[PDB]
Design a protein around this motif. Sequence first.
Motif, mmCIF file in Angstrom:
data_model
loop_
_atom_site.group_PDB
_atom_site.id
_atom_site.type_symbol
_atom_site.label_atom_id
_atom_site.label_comp_id
_atom_site.label_asym_id
_atom_site.label_seq_id
_atom_site.Cartn_x
_atom_site.Cartn_y
_atom_site.Cartn_z
ATOM 1 N N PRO A 205 0.800 -1.224 0.000
ATOM 2 C CA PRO A 205 0.000 0.000 0.000
ATOM 3 C C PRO A 205 0.838 1.284 0.000
ATOM 4 O O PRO A 205 1.820 1.398 0.763
ATOM 5 C CB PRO A 205 -0.823 -0.111 1.303
ATOM 6 C CG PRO A 205 -0.817 -1.550 1.643
ATOM 7 C CD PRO A 205 0.496 -2.079 1.169
ATOM 8 N N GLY A 206 0.443 2.224 -0.856
ATOM 9 C CA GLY A 206 0.999 3.576 -0.879
ATOM 10 C C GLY A 206 0.070 4.450 -0.059
ATOM 11 O O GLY A 206 -0.648 3.935 0.774
ATOM 12 N N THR A 207 0.060 5.754 -0.310
ATOM 13 C CA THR A 207 -0.844 6.671 0.414
ATOM 14 C C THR A 207 -1.966 7.233 -0.479
ATOM 15 O O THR A 207 -2.767 8.067 -0.043
ATOM 16 C CB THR A 207 -0.074 7.861 1.036
ATOM 17 O OG1 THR A 207 0.620 8.557 -0.004
ATOM 18 C CG2 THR A 207 0.943 7.379 2.094
ATOM 19 N N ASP A 208 -1.992 6.771 -1.728
ATOM 20 C CA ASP A 208 -2.920 7.231 -2.757
ATOM 21 C C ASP A 208 -4.345 6.664 -2.537
ATOM 22 O O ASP A 208 -4.537 5.719 -1.757
ATOM 23 C CB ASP A 208 -2.400 6.744 -4.096
ATOM 24 C CG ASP A 208 -2.298 5.225 -4.142
ATOM 25 O OD1 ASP A 208 -1.269 4.663 -3.658
ATOM 26 O OD2 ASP A 208 -3.269 4.610 -4.625
ATOM 27 N N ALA A 209 -5.319 7.226 -3.250
ATOM 28 C CA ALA A 209 -6.734 6.827 -3.161
ATOM 29 C C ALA A 209 -6.959 5.346 -3.457
ATOM 30 O O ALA A 209 -7.760 4.697 -2.780
ATOM 31 C CB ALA A 209 -7.576 7.660 -4.096
ATOM 32 N N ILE A 210 -6.295 4.818 -4.481
ATOM 33 C CA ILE A 210 -6.447 3.376 -4.776
ATOM 34 C C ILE A 210 -5.971 2.498 -3.605
ATOM 35 O O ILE A 210 -6.678 1.559 -3.204
ATOM 36 C CB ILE A 210 -5.804 2.953 -6.132
ATOM 37 C CG1 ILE A 210 -6.568 3.623 -7.285
ATOM 38 C CG2 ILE A 210 -5.907 1.455 -6.315
ATOM 39 C CD1 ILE A 210 -5.781 3.804 -8.555
ATOM 40 N N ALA A 228 -13.171 -3.418 -4.508
ATOM 41 C CA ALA A 228 -12.148 -2.385 -4.764
ATOM 42 C C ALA A 228 -12.102 -1.944 -6.224
ATOM 43 O O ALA A 228 -12.066 -0.756 -6.522
ATOM 44 C CB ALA A 228 -10.726 -2.894 -4.333
ATOM 45 N N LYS A 229 -12.089 -2.920 -7.121
ATOM 46 C CA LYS A 229 -11.986 -2.680 -8.557
ATOM 47 C C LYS A 229 -13.207 -1.920 -9.099
ATOM 48 O O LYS A 229 -13.079 -0.955 -9.879
ATOM 49 C CB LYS A 229 -11.850 -4.034 -9.242
ATOM 50 C CG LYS A 229 -11.839 -4.016 -10.753
ATOM 51 C CD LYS A 229 -12.070 -5.412 -11.298
ATOM 52 C CE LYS A 229 -13.456 -5.916 -10.954
ATOM 53 N NZ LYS A 229 -13.893 -6.982 -11.908
ATOM 54 N N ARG A 230 -14.387 -2.375 -8.682
ATOM 55 C CA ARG A 230 -15.669 -1.802 -9.102
ATOM 56 C C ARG A 230 -15.888 -0.404 -8.510
ATOM 57 O O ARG A 230 -16.626 0.411 -9.078
ATOM 58 C CB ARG A 230 -16.821 -2.736 -8.700
ATOM 59 C CG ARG A 230 -16.807 -4.101 -9.419
ATOM 60 C CD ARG A 230 -17.550 -5.174 -8.620
ATOM 61 N NE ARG A 230 -18.984 -4.930 -8.593
ATOM 62 C CZ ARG A 230 -19.831 -5.496 -7.747
ATOM 63 N NH1 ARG A 230 -19.411 -6.371 -6.835
ATOM 64 N NH2 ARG A 230 -21.112 -5.171 -7.812
ATOM 65 N N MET A 231 -15.241 -0.129 -7.380
ATOM 66 C CA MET A 231 -15.361 1.188 -6.767
ATOM 67 C C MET A 231 -14.354 2.184 -7.372
ATOM 68 O O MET A 231 -14.736 3.302 -7.736
ATOM 69 C CB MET A 231 -15.260 1.108 -5.250
ATOM 70 C CG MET A 231 -15.255 2.489 -4.564
ATOM 71 S SD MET A 231 -16.127 2.617 -2.945
ATOM 72 C CE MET A 231 -15.417 1.182 -2.128
ATOM 73 N N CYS A 232 -13.089 1.767 -7.493
ATOM 74 C CA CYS A 232 -12.030 2.574 -8.135
ATOM 75 C C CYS A 232 -12.336 2.979 -9.583
ATOM 76 O O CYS A 232 -12.109 4.139 -9.959
ATOM 77 C CB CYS A 232 -10.662 1.872 -8.041
ATOM 78 S SG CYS A 232 -10.058 1.863 -6.316
ATOM 79 N N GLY A 233 -12.843 2.027 -10.372
ATOM 80 C CA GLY A 233 -13.364 2.276 -11.721
ATOM 81 C C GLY A 233 -14.410 3.383 -11.844
ATOM 82 O O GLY A 233 -14.366 4.163 -12.791
ATOM 83 N N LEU A 234 -15.351 3.450 -10.903
ATOM 84 C CA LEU A 234 -16.357 4.524 -10.889
ATOM 85 C C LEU A 234 -15.714 5.867 -10.504
ATOM 86 O O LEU A 234 -16.080 6.928 -11.030
ATOM 87 C CB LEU A 234 -17.459 4.187 -9.891
ATOM 88 C CG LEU A 234 -18.598 5.184 -9.746
ATOM 89 C CD1 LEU A 234 -19.302 5.375 -11.092
ATOM 90 C CD2 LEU A 234 -19.565 4.672 -8.689
ATOM 91 N N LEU A 235 -14.776 5.813 -9.559
ATOM 92 C CA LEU A 235 -13.993 6.990 -9.182
ATOM 93 C C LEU A 235 -13.176 7.539 -10.353
ATOM 94 O O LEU A 235 -13.033 8.758 -10.475
ATOM 95 C CB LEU A 235 -13.090 6.703 -7.976
ATOM 96 C CG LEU A 235 -13.778 6.502 -6.624
ATOM 97 C CD1 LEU A 235 -12.696 6.224 -5.590
ATOM 98 C CD2 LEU A 235 -14.638 7.716 -6.198
ATOM 99 N N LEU A 236 -12.645 6.659 -11.205
ATOM 100 C CA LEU A 236 -11.960 7.100 -12.440
ATOM 101 C C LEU A 236 -12.919 7.771 -13.419
ATOM 102 O O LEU A 236 -12.598 8.823 -13.987
ATOM 103 C CB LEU A 236 -11.197 5.962 -13.141
ATOM 104 C CG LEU A 236 -9.666 6.034 -13.096
ATOM 105 C CD1 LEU A 236 -9.165 5.837 -11.680
ATOM 106 C CD2 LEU A 236 -9.016 5.008 -13.965
ATOM 107 N N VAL A 237 -14.099 7.179 -13.605
ATOM 108 C CA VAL A 237 -15.100 7.771 -14.484
ATOM 109 C C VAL A 237 -15.477 9.166 -13.958
ATOM 110 O O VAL A 237 -15.485 10.135 -14.718
ATOM 111 C CB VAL A 237 -16.369 6.869 -14.657
ATOM 112 C CG1 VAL A 237 -17.464 7.585 -15.450
ATOM 113 C CG2 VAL A 237 -16.016 5.537 -15.313
#
Length: 403
Positions: A205-210, A228-237
Amino acid sequence: LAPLPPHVPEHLVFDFDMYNPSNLSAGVQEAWAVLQECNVPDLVWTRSNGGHWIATRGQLIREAYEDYRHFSSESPFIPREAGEAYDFIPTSMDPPEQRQFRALANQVVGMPVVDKLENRIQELASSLIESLRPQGQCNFTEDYAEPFPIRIFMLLAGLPEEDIPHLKYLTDQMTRPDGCMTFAEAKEALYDYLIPIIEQRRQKPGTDAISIVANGQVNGRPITSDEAKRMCGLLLVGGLDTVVNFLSFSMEFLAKSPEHRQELIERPERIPAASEELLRRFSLVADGRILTSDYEFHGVQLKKGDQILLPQMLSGLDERENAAPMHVDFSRQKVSHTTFGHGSHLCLGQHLARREIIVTLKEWLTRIPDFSIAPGAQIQHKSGIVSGVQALPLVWDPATTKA
Ligand code: HEM
Ligand SMILES: *SCC1=CC(C)(C)N(O)C1(C)C
Ligand SMILES: *SCC1=CC(C)(C)N(O)C1(C)C
Ligand SMILES: CC1(C)[C@@H]2CC[C@@]1(C)C(=O)C2
Ligand SMILES: [K+]
């Protein structure tokens, strides 16, 4: 045009195409506003895009977004294939299941995050604007409206800038398909990109949003890779295709209206209220819901599995909500809208959005007070789940600017 289902009365038919609206040359908001002329019922069936309902008025739009029991967010995109494949978190989940995921998302985009990010937002805005200022022209969409919000997002998500072209492409296919990819294909390719990154940041883990999202807690346990994947993907959109489009509608307006510009030049403290009015007038999102059961809604018989477009854009354009809806009034006493949605899925990114919008207007109006549309340019808009501006060439006199 798909054949009219027997349960739909003929008088309710109005064949609006959300991806290619008839009156688009008048402006995208104007195109959608044809749905609110007096000859159109409150709830219509279009035979376009596989066929679906459209609520045309704020009252119905709000009611439907509140009543998730009848109008589920499990399939929130038209056409049906897109809503079927749509699985982003939290949006595709009905209450209460989505709450835990909203909380987690708020750890990466909530007000507290935005307040700590304000310095980078200001920094980037100032840097981009100052770079543009002595040039006396810009292609606004690609020179500012894209890289500004997108670089803030990539910074927040700790993702490489060199990935922007691939990702922006993919997100645009989900909102304004050019025909090259179905929504399902666009989504799976975005997932392809995210999976290894999510695995690496669950390993280290880094300190970034992902890193934060992929290692968070939901429902008394660790988030799964898939969630995680399904949530991060919407955040990218959200990061790549919302504010990006909205800033261009706003700047187009301000380029074309010297008097409104003068207001904010003369009284800079008005910029927040003005921003909200621009958010109403140039509202740009339109998704919806799917019927969970046979349901009579305002005397209209809806069947289980009917889709209903509930255009967030239309609520603030409804003259029932705002007198003279197409006219921009920075002084408007109550700016009624659902630009950021309504009910249990209220936009999580809206604080980031507002800050980006207000930082942009304040910094631009300070450095480049006087600017206009480039000679004989005709501004063309584009429609979809999120509507946009094709191009926005702007010009100004560098001698009128301040460094
Ligand atoms: C002008 C800018 C924006 C507009 C107009 C906008 C609009 C909306 C709308 C209408 C919804 C409701 C969708 C539905 O109910 O089906 C929504 C939800 C959402 N938005 Fe935004 N948004 C903006 C900025 C952002 C940004 C920048 C992000 C990411 C940083 C973001 C992330 C999200 C997320 C994650 C949801 C789902 C919330 C939930 O399902 O509980 N938004 N937004
Ligand atoms: S009341 C708005 C309106 C609807 C329609 C019947 C299409 N019209 O001709 C006008 C413009 C009067
Ligand atoms: S339409 C050209 C095209 C199709 C697909 C296979 C989805 N692509 O990656 C591109 C964009 C090249
Ligand atoms: C409709 C939206 C703007 C909201 C956040 C991104 C978006 C395209 C969604 O799928 C939900
Ligand atoms: K679905």
